[PDB]
């Protein structure tokens, strides 16, 4: 008897097993951007800057 | 003279100073020229 079940629990452990396609998707978008101006000034003989 | 200024005077007008063409002269008669450094500027 025990074997007539044991053989009945293995029966249904022994399925097979479906196997997943893990398929991932990774985007990343960088945009930059900048202006960077401006006047200096200056005069070296008695120094004075801008 | 103030310090919440970016410079203080009299590190700028000594540095204007170190900038000038120095003249080294030794008489009897040579006289020698040189120009400054601007690093203390």
Redesign the interface.
Known sequence: DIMNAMLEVIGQLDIRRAQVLIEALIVEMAEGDGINLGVQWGSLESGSVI | QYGNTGASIGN?MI??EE?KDTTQTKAVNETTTTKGDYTK?
């Open positions: 700028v540095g204007l900038a500027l």
